[PDB]
Amino acid sequence: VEPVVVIDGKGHLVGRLASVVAKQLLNGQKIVVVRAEELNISGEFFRNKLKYHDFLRKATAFNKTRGPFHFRAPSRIFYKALRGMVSHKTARGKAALERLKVFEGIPPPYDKKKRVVVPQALRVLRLKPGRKYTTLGKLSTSVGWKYEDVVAKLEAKRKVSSAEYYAKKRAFTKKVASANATAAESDVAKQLAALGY
Amino acid sequence: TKVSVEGVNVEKFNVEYFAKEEIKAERVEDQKVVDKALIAEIKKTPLLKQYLSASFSLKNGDKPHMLKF
Amino acid sequence: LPHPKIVKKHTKKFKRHHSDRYHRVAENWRKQKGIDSVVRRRFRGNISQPKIGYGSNKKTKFLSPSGHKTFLVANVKDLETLTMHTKTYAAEIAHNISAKNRVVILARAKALGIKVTNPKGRLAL
Amino acid sequence: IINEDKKKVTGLTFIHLPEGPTFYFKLSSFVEHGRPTSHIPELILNNFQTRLGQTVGRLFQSILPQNP
Amino acid sequence: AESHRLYVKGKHLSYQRSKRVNNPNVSLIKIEGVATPQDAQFYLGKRIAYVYRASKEVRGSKIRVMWGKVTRTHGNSGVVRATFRNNLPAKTFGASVRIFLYPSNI
Amino acid sequence: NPAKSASARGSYLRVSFKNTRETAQAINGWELTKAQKYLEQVLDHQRAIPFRRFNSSIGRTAQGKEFGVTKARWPAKSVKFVQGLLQNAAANAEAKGLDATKLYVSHIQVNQAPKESSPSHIELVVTEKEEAVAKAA
RNA sequence: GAAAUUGUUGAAAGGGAAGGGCAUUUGAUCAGACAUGGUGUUUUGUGCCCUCUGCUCCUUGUGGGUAGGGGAAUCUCGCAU
RNA sequence: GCCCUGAAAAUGGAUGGCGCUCAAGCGUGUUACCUAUACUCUACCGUCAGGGUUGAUAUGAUGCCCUGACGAGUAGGCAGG
RNA sequence: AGCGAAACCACAGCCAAGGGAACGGGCUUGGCAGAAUCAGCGGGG
RNA sequence: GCUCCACACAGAUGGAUACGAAUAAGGCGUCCUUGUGGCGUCGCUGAACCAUAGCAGGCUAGCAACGGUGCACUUGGCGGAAAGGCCUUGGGUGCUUGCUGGCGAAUUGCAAUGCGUGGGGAUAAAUCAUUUGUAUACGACUUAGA
């Protein structure tokens, strides 16, 4: 298939996404998730914002510091989520979340390299059209993550510097799709077609 | 892909043709009798002389339950 | 011999329960007898106990890897009883027979065609 | 000619080919940090007053190089 | 020139198990691209090799092997059952297993 | 090689076993001179012995930092026996005609004795450190 | 001169437990034929072989032990080449 | 019918966890698949039952076989080592 | 710096919840957890 | 670390094949009246795309192109999120299956994938020992000394 399947959250459902991202490591599959912050979920916002804090309270008694550590940053939010379906703790586990990697944003060296998605888990394609659905970003923040922006900003950058890229490419092709077009229709070609190609 | 084979004399070789009790000069004489009586028929079809010289392999996306041979 | 393929049934040693934890309790198998014992009640995961089903195929019993039955020979008279069963029995020279005596049991068994299970015993070159 | 009884080397014979003064030995020791050169090595011999001795002395003098 | 591959690249999933009790004799193999039991039927009874380097050289090659057969299918996904001579190690759960094309029916 | 080593046993020694285990192990694998000098320095409280097994209630000192330990002590009576031994071993080697400058305590070892008393045998063994080599083209 | 138990050395393992059972991997290690023919022909050479002459122990022919000569141009009867 | 309400505190807390929302929830239907020491079949062990076998069998008739069924077990009983 | 006991000893000793039976200490599901060691409280069993 | 000697040797097998945003919408192409603009067209799976023939890939003869590509160099530029890479200019040198050739393959016998040590030498620094007290149960900490 491919050795590294850089995924991409951007419109997925923390769950589901996970699960599969999961299985795939368990079955020896180096993944890498990006744009964590643009991960989604189900339900209103003022929920996930609960189904969480609660989570927050948790924490330990006698010694708060030793206990259920409440990570903020998206990435991790979603991590957990996942290190939660992988018998983590046991060689085969550790041996996984060993195979994982979840960045917010989409820093190098991944910027430069195709990503992809996981049908079987996009908002668009699973949530009964028009239904309440939260979007990490806020949901992180709302509860600590101090950067939403940096990401953001130091984003827009990327997008740029790319699209730009694009172009240059779109320009390129066009030429091909043109050469091939013309130098298309001469024998040789023909033939192929017969077979199909 | 089938060739013409009927031009070939093959009945010389049976099992016993393959005992051993540096290559035998007898064996190489039977090669060239077959081969030259064969090359001719491969030369009829386009690209077959080239097709045979190449190596078969599987390429990424060749799922051999789908594949036709 | 064109012997049957010898099935071993159970190759592990039948150790005694707890013969591993305590140094006093020995690897020599003994049944457990307390009625609160799990071994005696054969709960899952717990050690396999010798039952009669593990019994070997009567055709192949006693047969060693060579496909011969072991047989102890003390002296060169005792060997020459197998004069007729070279295909079936293997002359195990017995452990206490000396050096000077052995070299003589090997002379005959080689001549008779008896496969000795333990040559090179005490003996050098 | 070298022999093995068990998985260990033990006997070592040195026969001279015509006529034939012929010896036999029992190696005891053997083992394995030098990594020697292809230069030819010097001989030394120690304690051999006996005439039976300087016959074995008289062996090895011959069986190893007189080049060094 | 690029490929010398005459085999289909599957992964070694598990031992056939339950919730609780695994039998290590039946190794479960996913094969590449195979999705159904129908597509799998093709692979039934081809020889598998699991391949791996070890520390020490044995026969002039550091590169050891185990061999075995696809035996039957498993559920619908095309995950397939497979038995080796010596069983596959478990430490190799999620490792690549080279599935071959002899014996042909085709 | 036994043609290269000198040993020196001492047995049924009225020394704390546990302290000896230490001062021995402390000195294990040292060039005899650097070794003997070190036992003078424990005597003068310059350096201390890294107690490692039998060490409950040893007061932490900086001298432990030399080794990798926090705990370390200065034990007189133990070392008194061990440099007594080393001195002997040195002299054995000089009867054997060795180079004392290359010497080192290859193997030292201490195990209890019969007995309340708590006595202890010691056997240290010293060896020439073999070097000196060349080649040609 | 056992075991507990103790030291030294070497190997291995060790993220708030170890030892057990099923199964394999890796590492280290141990085995692993004074096995060497079988058959059918062919030169010769010998003997308990052929043949000449016997001598002796005993129980029933369907016997046993052992000398002297000669001879392979018949003989595979045995055994070596 | 589903949904909110239809009160319960006090160390952080659990549809088992993660998580799930045109479900991975509820109701129902259809098929496919997963697996027990269960069932089927074959071999093996042992036990029980029924037998075979002598002008004697190319192995101790207290042998050597043929057929079939069966196999949890404390006190306790019987038997072979 | 030396000399130098004894009592005691199945085995180990992290939380949270569940484990029906005034039974949780080994089990189930989680949170977690880095070697090594010294000084406090008078803290719980 | 530099230098001198002595030794020691969790699973690659054609290619991770770069827009962003929306999804009751979007690409992509074209005309410009420069727009939430028109006309054209695509999608309904990567089943694609690009690579892909040569002793596990040899040794040699030309034709046609003036391209493709490998390799150390060289010019200039870009990349700071984890840049640690990505492009380009110039020349040299291979290879070219774009086209046609000329040789070799056996017997492997009918399957069993085929960069650390242990000492020296030179030199950077830390620790111990000493000194100071802003520190101190002991440590640790702070100072000072060719």
mmCIF file of C-alpha atoms in Angstrom, chain A residues 41-132:
data_model
loop_
_atom_site.group_PDB
_atom_site.id
_atom_site.type_symbol
_atom_site.label_atom_id
_atom_site.label_comp_id
_atom_site.label_asym_id
_atom_site.label_seq_id
_atom_site.Cartn_x
_atom_site.Cartn_y
_atom_site.Cartn_z
ATOM 1 C CA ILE A 41 -17.424 15.308 16.859
ATOM 2 C CA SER A 42 -21.063 14.850 17.465
ATOM 3 C CA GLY A 43 -23.473 17.060 19.334
ATOM 4 C CA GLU A 44 -23.815 20.688 20.303
ATOM 5 C CA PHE A 45 -20.761 22.421 21.621
ATOM 6 C CA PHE A 46 -21.953 23.103 25.137
ATOM 7 C CA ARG A 47 -21.720 19.380 25.483
ATOM 8 C CA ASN A 48 -18.426 18.068 24.457
ATOM 9 C CA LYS A 49 -17.635 20.956 26.736
ATOM 10 C CA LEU A 50 -19.277 18.889 29.392
ATOM 11 C CA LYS A 51 -18.682 15.289 28.519
ATOM 12 C CA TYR A 52 -15.331 16.757 29.272
ATOM 13 C CA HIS A 53 -14.954 18.991 32.296
ATOM 14 C CA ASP A 54 -16.525 16.170 34.215
ATOM 15 C CA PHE A 55 -13.633 14.272 32.757
ATOM 16 C CA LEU A 56 -11.658 17.209 34.049
ATOM 17 C CA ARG A 57 -12.816 17.113 37.662
ATOM 18 C CA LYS A 58 -11.795 13.455 37.908
ATOM 19 C CA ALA A 59 -8.180 13.964 38.948
ATOM 20 C CA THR A 60 -6.699 12.374 42.090
ATOM 21 C CA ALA A 61 -7.498 12.967 45.752
ATOM 22 C CA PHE A 62 -4.678 12.907 48.280
ATOM 23 C CA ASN A 63 -2.328 13.901 45.444
ATOM 24 C CA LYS A 64 -3.881 15.746 42.525
ATOM 25 C CA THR A 65 -0.578 15.738 40.631
ATOM 26 C CA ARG A 66 -0.271 11.976 40.214
ATOM 27 C CA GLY A 67 -3.591 11.482 38.516
ATOM 28 C CA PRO A 68 -5.777 11.563 35.447
ATOM 29 C CA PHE A 69 -3.873 14.269 33.682
ATOM 30 C CA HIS A 70 -6.143 16.474 31.632
ATOM 31 C CA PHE A 71 -4.412 17.369 28.475
ATOM 32 C CA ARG A 72 -5.719 20.297 26.586
ATOM 33 C CA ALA A 73 -4.123 20.380 23.249
ATOM 34 C CA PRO A 74 -6.316 18.823 20.601
ATOM 35 C CA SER A 75 -3.795 16.408 19.306
ATOM 36 C CA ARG A 76 -3.704 14.731 22.689
ATOM 37 C CA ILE A 77 -7.471 15.113 23.238
ATOM 38 C CA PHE A 78 -7.800 12.867 20.332
ATOM 39 C CA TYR A 79 -4.860 10.745 21.265
ATOM 40 C CA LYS A 80 -6.416 9.553 24.465
ATOM 41 C CA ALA A 81 -9.552 8.951 22.581
ATOM 42 C CA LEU A 82 -7.471 6.355 20.851
ATOM 43 C CA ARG A 83 -4.903 5.094 23.309
ATOM 44 C CA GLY A 84 -8.207 3.975 24.668
ATOM 45 C CA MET A 85 -8.840 1.190 22.235
ATOM 46 C CA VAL A 86 -5.513 -0.537 22.075
ATOM 47 C CA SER A 87 -4.667 -2.589 25.102
ATOM 48 C CA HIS A 88 -2.039 0.049 25.832
ATOM 49 C CA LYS A 89 0.094 -1.264 28.581
ATOM 50 C CA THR A 90 1.270 -4.344 26.776
ATOM 51 C CA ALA A 91 4.158 -4.578 24.461
ATOM 52 C CA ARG A 92 1.755 -5.030 21.536
ATOM 53 C CA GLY A 93 0.014 -1.893 22.713
ATOM 54 C CA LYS A 94 2.962 0.338 23.483
ATOM 55 C CA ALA A 95 4.324 -1.192 20.352
ATOM 56 C CA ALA A 96 1.488 0.776 18.749
ATOM 57 C CA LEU A 97 0.933 4.263 20.055
ATOM 58 C CA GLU A 98 4.542 3.767 19.147
ATOM 59 C CA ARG A 99 3.449 3.690 15.561
ATOM 60 C CA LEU A 100 1.240 6.780 15.966
ATOM 61 C CA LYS A 101 1.700 10.547 15.683
ATOM 62 C CA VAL A 102 -0.850 13.350 15.972
ATOM 63 C CA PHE A 103 0.110 16.929 15.070
ATOM 64 C CA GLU A 104 -2.058 20.035 15.258
ATOM 65 C CA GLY A 105 -1.519 22.005 12.087
ATOM 66 C CA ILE A 106 0.458 20.147 9.513
ATOM 67 C CA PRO A 107 4.102 20.839 9.944
ATOM 68 C CA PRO A 108 6.926 19.493 7.873
ATOM 69 C CA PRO A 109 7.855 17.150 6.726
ATOM 70 C CA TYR A 110 4.182 16.442 6.067
ATOM 71 C CA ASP A 111 3.163 19.746 4.588
ATOM 72 C CA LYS A 112 4.940 18.655 1.466
ATOM 73 C CA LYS A 113 3.323 15.289 1.047
ATOM 74 C CA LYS A 114 -0.078 13.991 0.011
ATOM 75 C CA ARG A 115 -2.481 13.204 2.785
ATOM 76 C CA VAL A 116 -5.936 11.588 2.691
ATOM 77 C CA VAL A 117 -9.118 10.856 4.545
ATOM 78 C CA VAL A 118 -11.133 8.038 5.952
ATOM 79 C CA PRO A 119 -14.527 7.956 4.467
ATOM 80 C CA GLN A 120 -16.214 5.750 6.939
ATOM 81 C CA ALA A 121 -15.675 8.871 9.142
ATOM 82 C CA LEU A 122 -16.431 12.399 7.856
ATOM 83 C CA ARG A 123 -18.974 14.694 9.329
ATOM 84 C CA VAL A 124 -20.211 15.219 5.778
ATOM 85 C CA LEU A 125 -21.171 11.590 5.181
ATOM 86 C CA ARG A 126 -22.392 10.329 8.505
ATOM 87 C CA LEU A 127 -24.158 13.099 10.331
ATOM 88 C CA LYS A 128 -27.775 13.371 9.280
ATOM 89 C CA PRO A 129 -27.470 16.533 7.242
ATOM 90 C CA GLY A 130 -27.877 19.525 9.458
ATOM 91 C CA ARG A 131 -27.237 18.339 12.963
ATOM 92 C CA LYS A 132 -25.359 19.785 15.923
#
